[PDB]
Amino acid sequence: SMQDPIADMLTRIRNGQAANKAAVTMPSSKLKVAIANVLKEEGFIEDFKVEGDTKPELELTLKYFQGKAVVESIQRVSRPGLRIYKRKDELPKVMAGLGIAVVSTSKGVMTDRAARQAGLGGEIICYVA
Template identity: 30%
Template sequence: MLLDPMADALSTIKNAESTGKPECIVKPASKLIGNVLKVMQDAGYIGEFELVDDGKAGVFTVELKACINKCGVIKPRHYVKHTEFEKWEKRYLPAKKFGTLILTTSKGVMTHHEASEKGDGGQLLAYVY
């Protein structure tokens, strides 16, 4: 029984990275997980990823770059103003300017760096470094 698909996806990626695999399969696929993977790809943490139809919900095949130390979901999903990112960086990231918080805003899923540049707040989804 799968309770949190996002947590399962990120733990699959983290475990595959730690064992040195070149790629992994993330299932089930969802729009939110796809958007988070796109943000991770744009930030340079993963390579290409592709949605493969398996007759059910679909799966993502993700190419790994071996540059993720840790990643995970943030529970509960805290709402954060754009002026409060530093507080959450201290809580979830190991050092300043190292790592990324991923959040969902009214303008889509983005990193906390992009959100602070645009002056947007949102709900924290995950962290990666």
């Protein structure tokens, strides 16, 4: 009964890219804002914005290349039934480095590559190809 809002967000992005929607919308939270920020920094979505005041909504502008969608596959890793925490030399690469693994580290939510450069691990939220 809506116990993983992060996977609901990734599902909304995946369904929007499958249905060729130009922008998706969802309820917002600070973790969703941080994941949208790391996706916008890595160039998978166009932009993102928050709308409400006391019931804030997150609007993500999906990105499409010359024929198709930019986000090829997006998978939730640390589901609430099984949380997954990896050390700084067990941070995996996704698509051998061409994708990113969003890693909630101890000093913020960032990519696997930024976590491996800074030298700390943490929870691994999702894989993006």
